[PDB]
Amino acid sequence: KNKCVNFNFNGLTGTGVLTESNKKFLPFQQFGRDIADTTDAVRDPQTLEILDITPCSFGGVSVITPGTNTSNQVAVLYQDVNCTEVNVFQTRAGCLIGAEHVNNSYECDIPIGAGICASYQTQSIIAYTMSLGAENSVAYSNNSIAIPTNFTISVTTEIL
Amino acid sequence: PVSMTKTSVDCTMYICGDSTECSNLLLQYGSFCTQLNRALTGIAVEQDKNTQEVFAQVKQIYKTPPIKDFGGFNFSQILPDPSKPSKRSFIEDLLFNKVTKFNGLTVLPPLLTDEMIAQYTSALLAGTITSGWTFGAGAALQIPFAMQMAYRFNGIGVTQNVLYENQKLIANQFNSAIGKIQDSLSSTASALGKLQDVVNQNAQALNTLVKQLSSNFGAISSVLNDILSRLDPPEAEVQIDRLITGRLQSLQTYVTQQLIRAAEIRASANLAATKMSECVLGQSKRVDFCGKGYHLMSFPQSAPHGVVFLHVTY
Amino acid sequence: LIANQFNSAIGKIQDSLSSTASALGKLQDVVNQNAQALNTLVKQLSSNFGAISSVLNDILSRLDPPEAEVQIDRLITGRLQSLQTYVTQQLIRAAEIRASANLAATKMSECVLGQSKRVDFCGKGYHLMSFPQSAPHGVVFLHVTYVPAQEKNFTTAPAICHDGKAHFPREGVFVSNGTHWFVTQRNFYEPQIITTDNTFVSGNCDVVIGIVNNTVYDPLQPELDS
Ligand SMILES: *[C@@H]1O[C@H](CO)[C@@H](O[C@@H]2O[C@H](CO)[C@@H](O)[C@H](O)[C@H]2NC(C)=O)[C@H](O)[C@H]1NC(C)=O
Ligand SMILES: *[C@@H]1O[C@H](CO)[C@@H](O[C@@H]2O[C@H](CO)[C@@H](O)[C@H](O)[C@H]2NC(C)=O)[C@H](O)[C@H]1NC(C)=O
Ligand SMILES: *[C@@H]1O[C@H](CO)[C@@H](O[C@@H]2O[C@H](CO)[C@@H](O)[C@H](O)[C@H]2NC(C)=O)[C@H](O)[C@H]1NC(C)=O
Ligand SMILES: *[C@@H]1O[C@H](CO)[C@@H](O[C@@H]2O[C@H](CO)[C@@H](O)[C@H](O)[C@H]2NC(C)=O)[C@H](O)[C@H]1NC(C)=O
Ligand SMILES: *[C@@H]1O[C@H](CO)[C@@H](O[C@@H]2O[C@H](CO)[C@@H](O)[C@H](O)[C@H]2NC(C)=O)[C@H](O)[C@H]1NC(C)=O
Ligand SMILES: *[C@@H]1O[C@H](CO)[C@@H](O)[C@H](O)[C@H]1NC(C)=O
Numbered sequence A: 001k002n003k004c005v006n007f008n009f010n011g012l013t014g015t016g017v018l019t020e021s022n023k024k025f026l027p028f029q030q031f032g033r034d035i036a037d038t039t040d041a042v043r044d045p046q047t048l049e050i051l052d053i054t055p056c057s058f059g060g061v062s063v064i065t066p067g068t069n070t071s072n073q074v075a076v077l078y079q080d081v082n083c084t085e086v087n088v089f090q091t092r093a094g095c096l097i098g099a100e101h102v103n104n105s106y107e108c109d110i111p112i113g114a115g116i117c118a119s120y121q122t123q124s125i126i127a128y129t130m131s132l133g134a135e136n137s138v139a140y141s142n143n144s145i146a147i148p149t150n151f152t153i154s155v156t157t158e159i160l
Numbered sequence B: 001p002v003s004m005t006k007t008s009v010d011c012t013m014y015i016c017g018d019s020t021e022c023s024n025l026l027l028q029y030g031s032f033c034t035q036l037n038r039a040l041t042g043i044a045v046e047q048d049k050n051t052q053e054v055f056a057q058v059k060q061i062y063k064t065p066p067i068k069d070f071g072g073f074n075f076s077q078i079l080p081d082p083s084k085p086s087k088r089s090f091i092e093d094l095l096f097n098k099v100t101k102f103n104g105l106t107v108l109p110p111l112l113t114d115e116m117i118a119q120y121t122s123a124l125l126a127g128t129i130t131s132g133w134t135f136g137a138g139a140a141l142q143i144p145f146a147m148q149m150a151y152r153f154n155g156i157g158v159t160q161n162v163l164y165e166n167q168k169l170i171a172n173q174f175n176s177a178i179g180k181i182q183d184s185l186s187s188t189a190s191a192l193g194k195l196q197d198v199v200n201q202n203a204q205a206l207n208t209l210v211k212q213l214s215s216n217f218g219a220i221s222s223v224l225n226d227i228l229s230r231l232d233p234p235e236a237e238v239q240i241d242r243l244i245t246g247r248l249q250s251l252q253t254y255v256t257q258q259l260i261r262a263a264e265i266r267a268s269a270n271l272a273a274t275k276m277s278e279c280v281l282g283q284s285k286r287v288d289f290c291g292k293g294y295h296l297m298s299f300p301q302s303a304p305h306g307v308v309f310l311h312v313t314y
Numbered sequence C: 001l002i003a004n005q006f007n008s009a010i011g012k013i014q015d016s017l018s019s020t021a022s023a024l025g026k027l028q029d030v031v032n033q034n035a036q037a038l039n040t041l042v043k044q045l046s047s048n049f050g051a052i053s054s055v056l057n058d059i060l061s062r063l064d065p066p067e068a069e070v071q072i073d074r075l076i077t078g079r080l081q082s083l084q085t086y087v088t089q090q091l092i093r094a095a096e097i098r099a100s101a102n103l104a105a106t107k108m109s110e111c112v113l114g115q116s117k118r119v120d121f122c123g124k125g126y127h128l129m130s131f132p133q134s135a136p137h138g139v140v141f142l143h144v145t146y147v148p149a150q151e152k153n154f155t156t157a158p159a160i161c162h163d164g165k166a167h168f169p170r171e172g173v174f175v176s177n178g179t180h181w182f183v184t185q186r187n188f189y190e191p192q193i194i195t196t197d198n199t200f201v202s203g204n205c206d207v208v209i210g211i212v213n214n215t216v217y218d219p220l221q222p223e224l225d226s
């Protein structure tokens, strides 16, 4: 139990983590399935024990890299996996390795996701909560107005 | 609706469930798998861009002053409650309440968190209330709210004096209307149907994808492990090929529908971004672009996978 | 000054484009997407799809018609599917481009051929005029806008009380430097002495909230005295 194993119950192959289950199987019920109709519980043949089958932890691997031009140093994100299952920082995106978490917030450079962005800075890859922008309190008053005394003609480029 | 759930399907896992025999056969089908992954990734990135387009339209994170002397107009309901964990307004909370894997398909979290979207909407509203339309154009220039409203009245064609003389009445009518908004959202869920529909469509599509795994497609067993355990590799290959053909087709169907669906969402997001600019950041003279009536101002509220605009009209 | 500011800004446009390539990313992306799709299409010809050989000539060179047909069928099924995938993605991609083209046409009409009051539609600022430049598989718009540069705090009043009558500005806003009240237009500071021609009179002082007391000059009175 509690290990990723290749199990075989009565010629039923599968790979999963077997755990003691709390499911209320009725005496006749051989094995349990799911919402999706996926087998997720078994009654042991040699023992009257119900075992929940959890698929072995899998996740996508994303490599956070500043250009190779810039640096060959890389950070790896293991998506939706706990860090135990694998500069190690746990984000809502997944387990981030190779990046130093920094408190200071910066504009998002490389989006790791869930509000966390990475960049290459003085060097090492760093992970930070992205800043939305410079906080400003407008000088609002019931009798105060701000009128521009000058102007700037500005040309900006839109590409379609 | 501004965005969808970013969804990623590893086809080599979906099609063949950690089976090598199957994976080798899948190779013969070419780069079909890579192309599917690429398509879905494109959609996911587009979703993040959609949200940025609508919400991040504000130069700075403007904050409303502690003294809310807005000439009797009351915005407490649409302005955030700091007391709450996420700094969301009362109306945003109602909206959030209203709206309601192991097979290789996972959900990627959106780049901006709900709290960040709420901060962006708070910045927009603070800019709108304190500085009028000036924050869109440049540096937010403070103007008293009752005088800002008078300019907006000049915009629709009514003289400034009308607002000043009827200021108390207009403020009361405004406050009352916001009250009614609260009531409508609390009373009926149907109001957020557009958002719900988007959620439901994505859920149905994924449910269908998962169910298609149970289809045999003419193989002896839908379970890939059963085929391998019962048959020798030469014989198994034929049955596995049928499963592969069926599963790959099922996933192509899914990806294509999602591409089409994403395009529909992107159009809505583009519209939401255009309304954020011409309606929240300005006063639209376009008819019915910003609510039925003569548009005065409008206030954005974050909603799950969407934006809600409260259009004040005359 | 405006001409200089304009000329300077065009100078900066040249510099930006000359320096950084990333600026034309949207156009490049379109090119890249179409190239990847075609590259994929060509590579799928190398896929066997379960046939003995991906090469069609090899199949018929090695096998007699009855057997060859089976192998060819697999290749056909695979290749036809590959091409259907390509065409479908292209249809979807074309529709995305058509949307952009419609937007470019709309901006051509409302931004170059006119002056847009739609906000942000023609660039961040108050749109003045815009100029189109052809680009590969695209268009580039140089949006000239007006942005207020420098600003100053002034105390303001909705109206002024003269002789128990309330004066509101015809166009403009009342401002006070601290001692004297003037009427300026909202977008640029040009204070003018508050006069009957700068203001219209509606009602009385009592109903208006925030009304201040300032003399309203009548131009006619001196002329009568003279
Ligand atoms: C409005 O801003 C312009 C700059 O855009 C100011 O012009 C500058 O004036 C100073 C003082 O003579 C010079 O040193 C700069 O060379 C000028 N710049 C340009 C581009 O001409 C102008 O003086 C400003 N006016 C106000 C109201 O301050
Ligand atoms: C704006 O209106 C709201 C809604 O009536 C007021 O909020 C209420 O405040 C009182 C205390 O003054 C409480 O008893 C209510 O429970 C509050 N209601 C809600 C739902 O927030 C708000 O105080 C008013 N603000 C102004 C400026 O008058
Ligand atoms: C014009 O505006 C509204 C339209 O419904 C009404 O305003 C009411 O006026 C009465 C009497 O002054 C008040 O007691 C109510 O509180 C107001 N109601 C609202 C909706 O705010 C009324 O029909 C008209 N009022 C005037 C001032 O002409
Ligand atoms: C605000 O501007 C007004 C108008 O320029 C100023 O009033 C003038 O003050 C100067 C210097 O004392 C006099 O020479 C003028 O005769 C005044 N003009 C008027 C219209 O009476 C006023 O002093 C300025 N106040 C501040 C705070 O700078
Ligand atoms: C604006 O001027 C009017 C008229 O002089 C002021 O009203 C007077 O206020 C004083 C003090 O309360 C009273 O003694 C007078 O009887 C009032 N006269 C009238 C006709 O009402 C008003 O207070 C002034 N307001 C400001 C801003 O100074
Ligand atoms: C053999 O079967 C009996 C069934 O009651 C069971 O008690 C016992 O544990 C089994 N032994 C093995 C080999 O597990």
Ligand SMILES: *[C@@H]1O[C@H](CO)[C@@H](O)[C@H](O)[C@H]1NC(C)=O
Pocket: A069
């Ligand atoms: C790295 O980037 C710089 C700036 O774009 C460029 O000039 C240089 O050629 C690049 N070098 C490599 C290794 O590509």
Ligand SMILES: *[C@@H]1O[C@H](CO)[C@@H](O)[C@H](O)[C@H]1NC(C)=O
Pocket: A081, A082, A083, A090, A094
């Ligand atoms: C990892 O597991 C621990 C212990 O159960 C839990 O507290 C934590 O929330 C988990 N984190 C992730 C990334 O799921």
Ligand SMILES: *[C@@H]1O[C@H](CO)[C@@H](O)[C@H](O)[C@H]1NC(C)=O
Pocket: A103
């Ligand atoms: C960053 O924040 C954490 C608390 O979450 C703290 O342990 C650490 O000291 C901080 N970094 C500094 C102050 O360098």
Ligand SMILES: *[C@@H]1O[C@H](CO)[C@@H](O)[C@H](O)[C@H]1NC(C)=O
Pocket: A139, A146, C151, C152, C153
């Ligand atoms: C206006 O006044 C407030 C309060 O004194 C100040 O913080 C703000 O910087 C002022 N703005 C300008 C443009 O002078």
Ligand SMILES: *[C@@H]1O[C@H](CO)[C@@H](O)[C@H](O)[C@H]1NC(C)=O
Pocket: A142, A143, B069, C209, C210
């Ligand atoms: C503005 O608010 C102050 C208190 O902060 C109040 O005394 C004053 O009467 C108000 N003035 C206007 C312009 O209504």
